[PDB]
Design a protein around this ligand. Structure first.
Ligand SMILES: N=C(N)c1ccc2[nH]c(Cc3nc4ccccc4[nH]3)nc2c1
Ligand SMILES: [Ca+2]
Ligand SMILES: [Mg+2]
Ligand SMILES: [Zn+2]
Length: 223
């Protein structure tokens, strides 16, 4: 996250860190047994870490649970990143408490202008590499589809939306990938892609979760 701030320990209780020997992507806990992340974060051998703040220090509120199965969206296109969403089932149910809670799925899609909270342990430099150990947060509004499409001609589908600042300076970045974009108490986006990080007229692009609610509900109920 570039131009963001330290969230504070466990202030984003539905945020998960996907670990395969090191942190490589974020995710969102949707109920005690399932996590939603981005399909471009797919790997074999994932351990989900809940209740984290500093990912390099066991502070006491963590739960490390391995994944039993991963399901990448049936129509995910790795070349365009269209349908960039994946579901991960935990081997054991997590214990939900104040530090570990699930986030709600949306009943409708959000309007441009709505302010959201994006979080992650991804890179914090636009020009450089500085990876933080504690969770970073960023409040950003959803941008109109017009400004999103003008920035990326022929690359935005109806399953994506842009959020951010056209002036540059504030954005999510690699490592934040798969993480949550919460607006009005609902998970509305998943950190997906962008052009570099925090560049002018290159806002972040997010998977539009409101278009996948039936798929998510149907898939978790049958697995
Ligand atoms: N500017 C953005 N809003 C942005 C978000 C996410 C992202 N993701 C990548 C590529 C990317 N994602 C990953 C995940 C894990 C290892 C490497 C890696 N590279 N660029 C970006 C850019
Ligand atoms: Ca920790
Ligand atoms: Mg994240
Ligand atoms: Zn990524």
């Amino acid at each position: 996250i570039v131009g963001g701030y330290t969230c504070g320990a466990n202030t984003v209780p539905y945020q998960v860190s996907l670990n395969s020997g090191y942190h490589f992507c974020g995710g969102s806990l949707i109920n005690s047994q399932w996590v939603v992340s981005a399909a471009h974060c797919y790997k074999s051998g994932i351990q989900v870490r809940l209740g984290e703040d500093n990912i390099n220090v066991v502070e006491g509120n963590e739960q490390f649970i391995s994944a039993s199965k991963s399901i990448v969206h049936p129509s995910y296109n790795s070349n365009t990143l269209n349908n960039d969403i994946m579901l991960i089932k935990l081997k054991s149910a997590a214990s939900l408490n104040s530090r570990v809670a699930s986030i709600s799925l949306p009943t409708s899609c959000a309007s441009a202008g709505t302010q959201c909270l994006i979080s992650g342990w991804g890179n914090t430099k636009s020009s450089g590499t500085s990876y933080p150990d504690v969770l970073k947060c960023l409040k950003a509004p959803i941008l109109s589809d017009s400004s999103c499409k003008s920035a990326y001609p022929g690359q935005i589908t109806s399953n994506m939306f842009c959020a951010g600042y056209l002036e540059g300076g504030k954005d999510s970045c690699q490592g934040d990938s798969g993480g949550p974009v919460v607006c009005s108490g609902k998970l509305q986006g998943i950190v997906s892609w962008g052009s570099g990080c925090a560049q002018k007229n290159k806002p972040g692009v997010y998977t539009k979760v409101c278009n996948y609610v039936s798929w998510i509900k149907q898939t978790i109920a049958s697995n």
